[PDB]
């Protein structure tokens, strides 16, 4: 069987092709002690670093879909194969994922490590938005994939991708966490360390939601108190947040909140559709597929439906497809693809990599 | 039974002799994907290419009645026999059509393909304007046949053709579509791709008409707004056109709109009659037969009646015969001819083609 | 009853002896298609060829009273018996006519065809000018017979012919038609084909007349416009002719207009009278009988009266007998002769023709 | 000195009497721009219109020897006098030419323009075939003159013309150009515009020839490829023609190729001789004089010799006189005639034209 | 003196007629602050917006030759007259330019603003490709004008335009900048904001060039490193690009790189020549005039020469005219035209605009 590893900027999702859910889901972090030992490992990975984060400096080796720390990334891959999955990587072909419009050297270093450090027999790097469409059982649709580092739109029609219409936005979950950390200081809550950033991320996943109309919601939060929620910190302190619950996800639709010039995910989706041929726009309007953890906010599909309806012609039927399992859509689609008999010829074996060089990894790549 | 295939520049009309309507009417197009596949056939033909035109480059194998892409033309013939008609071509004699004054090699290659690729038992290539006269139940008349590529006038009197009076004009429906694409840019509508050319052709068939007096109609469209019509594009956008509705078909009467030096179809019809013997002109004046899709504009028979009346002597009775089924007149006449018992000796069998060579196909051909 | 067939160079006049008018009068033409058939007979005869002359080449089998195309002449005789008269020629004796001073083989071939192809029981070939005198109820007079091919003068006195005084002129209606075609080019009217020659013949029969004084009429046509007449062509075009109306028949009196050296019909008539015995000239002067279609011009009897009066002595009484039915005088006289009881011994039966050979047909023949 | 202007349907040949060649030879065309000027004259004449024909509509003011556009004909005469010859027409008597059997008003309008617009002192309109006989130094012969519009036969014997034997055929070089344009479509070459008609005329003058035996030549062209010739178009495209080289001039001998009913130039020449007196036919048989550009095909004199030999009695000596300068024979003969001292009394002066009216111009005219 | 303003999609070029270079050349941009002021104008135009682009959102009011933001376009015209040229527009006639095949309302709004907002005495809207031909001192040639928004081919022959042969391509410098921004992400360089798009445009103008053979150049860049160039960003960062230098301009010859279906500028130029009359193609082949900033790539004339030579017949002489000043050819030609004495009647004065309405501005317009 093949291994399917979805290395996101935030979470590692690994498992075996044919399964319906990842077997190993843990944070893509490496923690190192920032104090002096007096009485123990030198670095902690994943959930181990998450339980000891009080005395660690946590670092993400992947930033905006681009692997920046290759020594830390190998520790995470090593822990994925030997600790979480407990397999020998030299026996399973490995399907990896990558965001579109990434640097070419990122995929070439991933391939060199898998073939020369882990000695995988074969491997393949798929585009995350294409796997997300396999998971929904579709061949046509525009995928909005938003994870921890990257948000991207990829339109696909009858199995054909339109690379010139691909949009990429370096604004996802990690930027929303940093913005929530900033606006929490308005109530006197100070989260500074990398360990406290993990607390704010947990606050974001529990209490944040997308408002249907942002200006009406800002007036409701300023008048009454029905939007206030409480949250208990790990040390028993209780914090209460009001309009920060919907001001944080609103950055997805108004990136100027964090000083970005780009348009929101609704205009970016609409602009990607308008770059496509006029004859396929009607099918793309009816097949807006959402995937990734950053699309898991309550009310984001209704807000997305409302914003694109206002941009598109009134005759078009806008349909946002947001399954409840869309947090694992890239992995589930990769599990489906790696099990197809037609795909078994797409593997890049170790023999082909030695004779064709690193240039063989850029096939069907955009 | 015999097969009747009317291969126009725009549409394929195929069926069985004895029927009153073609069984298969689909566009004579071959589409090939112009993007990268990521998830499918290599080429699409006919209505299949029309429904996927968003991701295809559409090409017509026939241009101005002359087959230019013989590999694509065989795909269309193959799809006609096996997909649309679902017959074995080696069991039915095939009646084909052709515009007059075509290159000799065009008919010789059509015959070689039908005998050596499809292995038809017998075949015959008729002149389209002669079949159009069979459809109207006449033996005398001048036929104005205008399709997608060619407009031609063929005068016939008591079953005798006058080849020296045959006029051919490389200006038909496809040139009107290209001219409509050009004048639509005056309102800011940009149709560029081959798929968008199919949208403009659909606009032309729905909204364009022939003005009785062009200068009076240009003054009416410039003063009020009663001539404005709206049309919804496939993506919900609504376009509104005014004088473009009658400026596009006016090119048939003023070919200088597209930079051509020839005279309009009314003068060409009159010049063809004046090249005939004086004793038959009165019968030709009363039997102007229209055929083809480009004669389907509302008001073209009244305009044709008005223009030829102004050219002919005032004592002559000008009568334009334009039946509502004239879009299929060539096929209907070919169905009538292929069912005549007298015609059963006109078939060019496979045996005659082997002993007489390709020169046998140029009999009763002009 | 007997058949009377007057085979002129221009018209066939056939009927039954005892009647007062021919039952079948149609042009002596055979037309053959000069174009390609695409949708019909191989040749057309008589009025059928006249209605389809637009697509035919028309040929006269008789030229200057001499049958030149014997295959076409048999088609005309066949159509006369079976289509126009609808009789069996093997049951009726046939009276035929012939111009004087014809080749001997012309009458011998006519007799061989009537006896061996149509199997007539008996036949007789009369001289046309003698029949013309029977029609006027006379035994004395000089007959001026002018048809389509031949003009001839035959003087007869008390039932006796004077063959040495017979004049023959190869100038008749067909030469006048050709001359009218030539002088019509002076006004820009171009009649070239054999079908257009039939149009000019119709113009000649409607608008041409004989001027009493040619030089005074030429001055009147050159000064005013009262002699101009209009004529509508079969295609609606209107032509206008002035002095051509009387210049065409003037060729009969001035054969030098068409390059002939002979004298006009007035001098030829006078020369024929002066070749006769002096004692019969007074009776011939008073009995100038006109016959044939070429004597049907308005004013030809007054002009003939004026010209012969100027040549003859002033004491003689010149009387031109021109009945209104003189276009059929040869047939009417043949109908009278074939009904006489005295003539019933003059028939050349099939039995006499077999035993006496072809030489029996030259009896009372000049 | 006198001016000699030979206004043919195709070329203008002008010069001074006494010279042996025309000083000005240019096409008789008037071109007008058929596009929009954005950056120039309103009309171009002659060689100027020929060098700018790409953006012009070219029109011939003379069609079949008959001046149809009198405003354009005056531009050509104006350019002849002031630009090409650079003379004052009010100082030189002008000898003009005309085809026989032309409309009377054509010569009367030419005379009115020369006397009232150009104010020539005297003028004379000669018959083209008579001038062609002056050029060959003969007084007896039948002239076959074939130019761009008209082909005509004029027999002359000892200085006497036989007008009744004059044949005129509206089939010359321009009809051969149009027929070559038609049969070039058999190889896929499309020449449509008036500018492209000038290209086909240049092809005809370079590659066309008269076959000695047409059926043997058709078999040679269909078997091998030795008759194929190449020709480079003005834009670098190379066309190759085979049997079209001799099928185009064959129309002169088989006018049915273009749907004409008349006989070829060989039968027309023979028919003209047979209309002449029997005593002069032997001299006409030995003096067949060819003139005009349409007699410049290679092998037309040998073919003409062969065809007339087959029609004439075997004892007659058929001699076709075709000098290499016969393209200018009408002008050269007009230069000889205008220099004769005997001719100096034949001029129609301006004084005679005012007192005698337009009727004076029809003297020695047929 | 007259004002000549060449409003391109990218640059404004303004000056006075009679000068040899524009006096004011600045970017056609309007920038507005996208941050909060704490310590200043509300919008910046031209070079002022370019020096403060760090805190601005830059917008082009002209997109693909079509003015989309009319309020911003008036700010640019206002800054052109009063700041850059420092004149009173109510005293100078203004010559404006426009791309062919533009919407009719674009030119009508430009005229209404110049007459009612700036109160110019007269104005004229010329076609840019016609002015480019004035600059090269020619009357014949096909102009390839490629600026920031539009690429168009206009063939002109002897001062006559052929509007039916005009090609327009919505692919120019701005699309090349966007494509360079996309392929720079392959090396890890992220340019996203509108201010960073101006940095990429500066990279394109310094380092990009057209490869003579694209496939050989791709092999050279992949083997060695001689094609690598370095560029210093405004903040001191140094980027290095290799094959992106010639992959960006290659989009002009392979528009499929950016997902466009149209053919490259070489085939578009050849197709425009083949739509012209055959007699003018040789002159168009020798006079390919390049203009605009997008034709300023090193090696584009040699590549254009090589591509058209492969399409045209081998006998034709292909000559690409690319002067070193072709970046200002439209302005220089407009300065020449506005100084011609013949042009002084072409001005559309304020009086004519009031009585004739907005329809007067569409004269000599295509
Ligand atoms: N219920 C939730 N609501 C909002 N955000 C969530 C939720 N669950 C996860 N996320 C966010 O999703 C982001 C990453 O999810 P994932 O799709 O795994 O991205 P990646 O593929 O980059 O690892 C994290 O930043 C996390 O904060
Ligand atoms: N209702 C209509 N009005 C105007 N044009 C039409 C209409 N229907 C069809 N056409 C035109 O007729 C053309 C071809 O019709 P057809 O007679 O099938 O030609 P062909 O025989 O060349 O295929 C097409 O260009 C199409 O645009
Ligand atoms: N009304 C008429 N006026 C002048 N010519 C006439 C008239 N009617 C007939 N003809 C001429 O008479 C000629 C033949 O008449 P017809 O006496 O039948 O001669 P034929 O006996 O040779 O057939 C034709 O050429 C025709 O043109
Ligand atoms: N070498 C040649 N071969 C064949 N045809 C020629 C040649 N030269 C000229 N012609 C033809 O001669 C025709 C006219 O010649 P010309 O005698 O000047 O006639 P016109 O007197 O009517 O102007 C033109 O149609 C031209 O095509
Ligand atoms: N040296 C150069 N090399 C390549 N492109 C250039 C160069 N200089 C200018 N350009 C490009 O030319 C384009 C616009 O130039 P211009 O001719 O002024 O167009 P417009 O008339 O549309 O303003 C810009 O996109 C710019 O990038
Ligand atoms: Mg992800
Ligand atoms: Mg058709
Ligand atoms: Mg008779
Ligand atoms: Mg001539
Ligand atoms: Mg520009």
UniProtKB/Swiss-Prot annotation, chains A, B, C, D, E:
The record's GO CC annotations read: actin filament; actin filament bundle; cell body; cytoplasm; filamentous actin; filopodium; lamellipodium; skeletal muscle myofibril
Region (Interaction with alpha-actinin) residue ranges read: 101-114, 349-361
Residues the record lists as Tele-methylhistidine modifications: 64
Pfam families from the UniProt entry: Actin
Q: What is its main location?
A: cytoplasm
According to the UniProt record, list the residues that bear ADP-ribosylarginine. Answer: 168
Going by the entry's taxonomy, the superkingdom of the source organism is recorded as Eukaryota
ATP-binding as UniProt keyword: yes
The UniProt entry, under PROSITE patterns, shows: ACTINS_1 (PS00406), ACTINS_2 (PS00432), ACTINS_ACT_LIKE (PS01132)
Q: Which SMART domains match?
A: ACTIN
Q: Please give the Gene3D superfamilies that the UniProt record associates with this protein.
A: 3.30.420.40, Actin, Chain A, domain 4 (3.90.640.10)
* GO molecular-function term, one example from the UniProt record: troponin I binding
Q: Which UniProt keywords apply?
A: Acetylation, ADP-ribosylation, ATP-binding, Cytoplasm, Cytoskeleton, Hydrolase, Methylation, Muscle protein, Nucleotide-binding, Oxidation
| Location within or outside the cell | Cytoplasm, Cytoskeleton
Task: Tell me the residues on which N6-methyllysine occurs.
Answer: 75
GO terms for biological process? actin filament bundle assembly; actin filament polymerization; mesenchyme migration; positive regulation of gene expression; skeletal muscle fiber development; skeletal muscle thin filament assembly
Catalytic activity, reaction form: ATP + H2O = ADP + phosphate + H(+)
| Residues modified as Methionine (R)-sulfoxide | 39
Q: Which residues carry this modification: N6-malonyllysine?
A: 52
Q: How does it assemble?
A: Polymerization of globular actin (G-actin) leads to a structural filament (F-actin) in the form of a two-stranded helix. Each actin can bind to 4 others. Interacts with alpha-actinin. Identified in a complex composed of ACTA1, COBL, GSN and TMSB4X. Interacts with TTID. Interacts (via its C-terminus) with USP25.
Q: Which family does it belong to?
A: Belongs to the actin family.
- What's this protein's function? Actins are highly conserved proteins that are involved in various types of cell motility and are ubiquitously expressed in all eukaryotic cells.
* The name this protein goes by in its record: Actin, alpha skeletal muscle
């Amino acid at each position: 069987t093949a291994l399917v590893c979805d290395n996101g900027s935030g979470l590692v999702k690994a498992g075996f092709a044919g399964d319906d859910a990842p077997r190993a889901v843990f944070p893509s972090i490496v923690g190192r002690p920032r104090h002096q030992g007096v009485m123990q490992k030198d670095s902690y990975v994943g959930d181990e670093a998450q339980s000891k984060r009080g005395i660690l400096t946590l670092k993400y080796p992947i930033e905006h879909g681009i692997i920046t720390n290759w020594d830390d990334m190998e520790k995470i891959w090593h822990h994925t194969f030997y600790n979480e999955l407990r397999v020998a990587p030299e026996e399973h072909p490995t399907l990896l994922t990558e965001a579109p419009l990434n640097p070419k050297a990122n995929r070439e270093k991933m391939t060199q490590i898998m073939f020369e450090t882990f000695n995988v027999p074969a491997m393949y790097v798929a585009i995350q938005a294409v796997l997300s469409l396999y998971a929904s059982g579709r061949t046509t649709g525009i995928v909005l994939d938003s994870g921890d580092g990257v948000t991207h739109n990829v339109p696909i029609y009858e199995g054909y991708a339109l690379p010139h219409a691909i949009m990429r936005l370096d604004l996802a979950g990690r930027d929303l966490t940093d913005y929530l950390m900033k606006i929490l200081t308005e109530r006197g809550y100070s989260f500074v360390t990398t360990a406290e950033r993990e607390i704010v991320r947990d606050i974001k996943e529990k209490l944040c939601y997308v408002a249907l109309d942002f200006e009406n919601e800002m007036a409701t939060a300023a008048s009454s108190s029905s939007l206030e929620k409480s949250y208990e910190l790990p040390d028993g302190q209780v914090i209460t947040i009001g309009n920060e619950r919907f001001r944080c996800p609103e950055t997805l639709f108004q990136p100027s909140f964090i000083g970005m010039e780009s348009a929101g995910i609704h205009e970016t989706t609409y602009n990607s559709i308008m770059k496509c041929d006029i004859d396929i726009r009607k099918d793309l309007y009816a097949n807006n597929v959402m995937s990734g953890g950053t699309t898991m906010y309550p009310g984001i599909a209704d807000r997305m439906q409302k914003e694109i309806t206002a941009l598109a012609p009134s005759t078009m039927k806008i349909k946002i497809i947001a399954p409840p399992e869309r947090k694992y859509s890239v992995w589930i689609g990769g599990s489906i693809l790696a099990s197809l008999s037609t795909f078994q010829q797409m593997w890049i074996t170790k023999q082909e990599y030695d004779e064709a060089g690193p240039s063989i990894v850029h096939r069907k790549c955009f």
